[PDB]
Design a protein around this nucleic acid. Structure first.
Length: 82
DNA sequence: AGATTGCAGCACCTGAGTTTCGCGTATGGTCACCCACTACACTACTCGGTCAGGCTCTTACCAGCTTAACTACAGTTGATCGGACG
């Protein structure tokens, strides 16, 4: 049901991998504030290459835009509903 | 019409053809980092010219004389020059 409510599909058939789904859960927790890709990377505990390669699987669910943070160039992520 | 026997029907364990799958193994693709090369504008030390300072060499002497040449006066002859010719 959590899978279905967030992705629109059940765990039994959804195309999103477990790691990418946990990324989505972090964006779900942050809601209206959303998460920048580096704080997401730090909180999930994985590197920016891995985060970027995974985020492709969910870019249709997320509104995004560029921003500059701690001298690095990053994007903000928000679920469409927020 | 009974003692001997086969048909074949019931049920349950089993087997392969067929399928879906997981992984190896390996291949094209994302993207993040940091490197090499280039270059417009700059930093800064030296060399170089110019100037003064002031120590330095070398001159040539005054009138006279006494060792040395010129420096004017002077006369018939050049050959460019004017200006007109062909």
């Amino acid at each position: 049901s959590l899978w279905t409510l967030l992705t629109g599909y059940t765990k039994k058939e959804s195309t999103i991998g477990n790691s990418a789904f946990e990324l989505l859960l972090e964006v779900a927790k942050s809601g209206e504030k959303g998460i920048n890709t580096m704080d997401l990377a730090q909180v999930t505990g994985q590197d920016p290459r891995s985060v970027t390669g995974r985020i492709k699987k969910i870019n249709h669910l997320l509104t995004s835009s560029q921003l500059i943070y701690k001298g690095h160039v990053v994007k903000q992520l928000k679920l469409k509903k927020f």
